[PDB]
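#struct-pred

JT: dropping the chains for the assembly here, can someone run the whole complex?
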Amino acid sequence: AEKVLVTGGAGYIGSHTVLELLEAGYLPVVIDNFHNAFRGGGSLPESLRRVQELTGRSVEFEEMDILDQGALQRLFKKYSFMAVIHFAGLKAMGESVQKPLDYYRVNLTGTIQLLEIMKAHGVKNLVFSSSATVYGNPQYLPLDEAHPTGGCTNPYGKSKFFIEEMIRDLCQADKTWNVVLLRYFNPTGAHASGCIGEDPQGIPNNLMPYVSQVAIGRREALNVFGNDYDTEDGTGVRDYIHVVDLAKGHIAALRKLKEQCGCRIYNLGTGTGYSVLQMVQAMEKASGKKIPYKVVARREGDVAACYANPSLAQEELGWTAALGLDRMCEDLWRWQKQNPSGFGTQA
Amino acid sequence: AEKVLVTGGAGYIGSHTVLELLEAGYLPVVIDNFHNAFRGGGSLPESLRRVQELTGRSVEFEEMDILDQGALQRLFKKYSFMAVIHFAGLKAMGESVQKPLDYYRVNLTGTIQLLEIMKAHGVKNLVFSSSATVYGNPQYLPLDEAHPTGGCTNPYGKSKFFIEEMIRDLCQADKTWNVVLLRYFNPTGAHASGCIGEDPQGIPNNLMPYVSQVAIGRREALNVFGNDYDTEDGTGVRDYIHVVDLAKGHIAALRKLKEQCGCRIYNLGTGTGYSVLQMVQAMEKASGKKIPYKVVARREGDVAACYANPSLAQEELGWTAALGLDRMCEDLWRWQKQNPSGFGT
Ligand SMILES: NC(=O)c1ccc[n+]([C@@H]2O[C@H](COP(=O)([O-])OP(=O)(O)OC[C@H]3O[C@@H](n4cnc5c(N)ncnc54)[C@H](O)[C@@H]3O)[C@@H](O)[C@H]2O)c1
Ligand SMILES: NC(=O)c1ccc[n+]([C@@H]2O[C@H](COP(=O)([O-])OP(=O)(O)OC[C@H]3O[C@@H](n4cnc5c(N)ncnc54)[C@H](O)[C@@H]3O)[C@@H](O)[C@H]2O)c1
Ligand SMILES: CC(=O)N[C@H]1[C@@H](OP(=O)(O)OP(=O)(O)OC[C@H]2O[C@@H](n3ccc(=O)[nH]c3=O)[C@H](O)[C@@H]2O)O[C@H](CO)[C@@H](O)[C@@H]1O
Ligand SMILES: CC(=O)N[C@H]1[C@@H](OP(=O)(O)OP(=O)(O)OC[C@H]2O[C@@H](n3ccc(=O)[nH]c3=O)[C@H](O)[C@@H]2O)O[C@H](CO)[C@@H](O)[C@@H]1O
Ligand SMILES: [Cl-]
Ligand SMILES: [Cl-]
Ligand SMILES: [Cl-]
Ligand SMILES: [Cl-]
Ligand SMILES: [Mg+2]
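RK: done, full complex below.
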């Protein structure tokens, strides 16, 4: 009967996670400030309104910013949370390098504040959205949890690293805390219903949505960011993981917290890397459409190849990414086709 | 466009720096929340009251917390600053390891809030209190600015490294910013007057104050944290730097900002390391008192030796520490002796 607080729950990964939580018998309380989520016709974000329909279960939601101390305090006072799943934050839209203070404020001070409010309310169980970016430029592959962290590039990645570090210390100082830090790889795909998915605003900065937008006919050609990398085909290689598998990894994380695990860190990836061209091809196959593209200049700070060593998670978390490349592509296409312009308010 | 904001200016290093600022003709505006500063009988913290008396110049002060956005806004509206010297923060009262959230809140959130207001008001000139702790366990000695940083011992040291990194990012993103990050070594000593100095509450965590307290008779004996290190005498070696020189280093930092230097990093040390025993001996000489000691276990996480490579600071900032060991000890003793209970009770 104790709830699970889900911050940033109206977004891509959060919405899918709320759905999994609901199906698994959990009772979420979701908060979001609409920074990167579409408002529905009603009080609920559209994504969550659809989750409610898909599951036939009610979504408890509050529009709120994690930076709003008073609101957050009242929330923790009103409910008895048994854990918090923290998705809220800014991600880079290639932005971070240019607005460091926004990233430091939203991600860093926002999480510090959340942790303080959690502590004060006796809630010491956390699931944190981390990223493979913390590893910086891979020194070796695949990337296991022991790979060095904090070496590279941007304010976004740094913010994630500083957060992990802070949580590690917190756990070190107080053994009563339990925290699972999940380093996601490259989330893709969508719920199999095709009703919810990634809903980018404007020109997508990430690969897959751009690809699907081309396939759907909204964009003429994919711009491939360099083809001279030291990879098989010259294009960047990444570990794409189905958002549904990723969402389920959060449920596994909650179970881990119940073991009084202390601080634990796990990669959430498939362990299989695919190049840009490979993804294009898979999308042609899923969509049944030809996907044009043009090779352009490299994108500043792009790594050649990145992919996970998923063993720890399989072993300790009791989780594995069950969905393959075709599934990811087919699910992405379904969402895209059924919702040519992303989320919209009900007719 | 004229004033210099000094956060945590009522503290040990900050009060000495305010004094130096005044003497050099700057107009400081100080803020402090009294978290680690003693309140006098008036508005001003005792330390600042004294500085005012010593310099014969007025000290503009506002009691406030850097964590208070509203207060920051009001402050920046009231005064026109040309630069900010940021001393405010929590130091380890050996505490950091145990209370991460307090450190992260005050040091990280507090500094971010400050940088935001600075940015908002177009005051893009900062001098930051960093520390040699950012270098972590020395890989080589002396420590130059090029030595690796990060991988800090504690939540406190981590906090310092995180802040340097955020500032670096800020300067990268906006070429208009100028920031001088000062990595202090081991500050000691006191103003020659003997009127102000470090005023620790409770059992001091740092060597020097502990030593002075044993000399004055407040403590029975000094506990020496190990004598089996790979140092000449087996005891820990550090680069003790006179707080007056350190304060002057901040003035040199202000002048550096004027050059539109972007982000610059400098060690503030003497380049000379002394062992625990050498400090004890020097203090016995300075005080004329005996300082009994007992060798105990190594303190968790202590480094064997740490000292600075002062070349870059001399070359680029045009600054060098002028006061040596005897002077440090003489000044520290004067303060302790003339003020057996610090600033008050
Ligand atoms: N998508 C990826 O490839 C990826 C990779 C690694 C890690 N992550 C991390 O996972 C999390 C979720 O990513 P996502 O793809 O779902 O992004 P998203 O932008 O769709 O989801 C984040 C949600 O947080 C909300 N939010 C932002 N600032 C907020 C604030 N101050 N208060 C409350 N809510 C706020 C946004 O409105 C949004 O709905 C983020 O922390 C992200 O950094 C994502
Ligand atoms: N003394 C050292 O050995 C040492 C070593 C290296 C770096 N540093 C750093 O130099 C700075 C000054 O150190 P110090 O020895 O003078 O310490 P100090 O404690 O005497 O000075 C810090 C001052 O900041 C004030 N303060 C704390 N939190 C505040 C807040 N939220 N808002 C406003 N004021 C606040 C305190 O009341 C105090 O007067 C600190 O950032 C410290 O971490 C000191
Ligand atoms: C949200 C996030 O964390 N993004 C980061 C992630 O991107 P990351 O590279 O992992 O993910 P993307 O989806 O942006 O790119 C995937 C691959 O497709 C390529 N591609 C993408 C889009 C496009 O229009 N054309 C194209 O060719 C990219 O070059 C890359 O090789 O790590 C990168 C490398 O550190 C960072 O620079 C990004 O800021
Ligand atoms: C590992 C470490 O750096 N810890 C802190 C200490 O550093 P740091 O160790 O440099 O400075 P200290 O003043 O605490 O100790 C200096 C030397 O004296 C020894 N000593 C100290 C006190 C005592 O009672 N007996 C004794 O023998 C120590 O082992 C060390 O060799 O103070 C700093 C501020 O000045 C903090 O930023 C550091 O978090
Ligand atoms: Cl609704
Ligand atoms: Cl390469
Ligand atoms: Cl007064
Ligand atoms: Cl804490
Ligand atoms: Mg393994």
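JT: nice. The pocket of chloride ion (ligand 8) is lined by residues B 99-102 (CB under 6 Å). Chain A has two domains: 189-238+270-345, 2-188+239-269.
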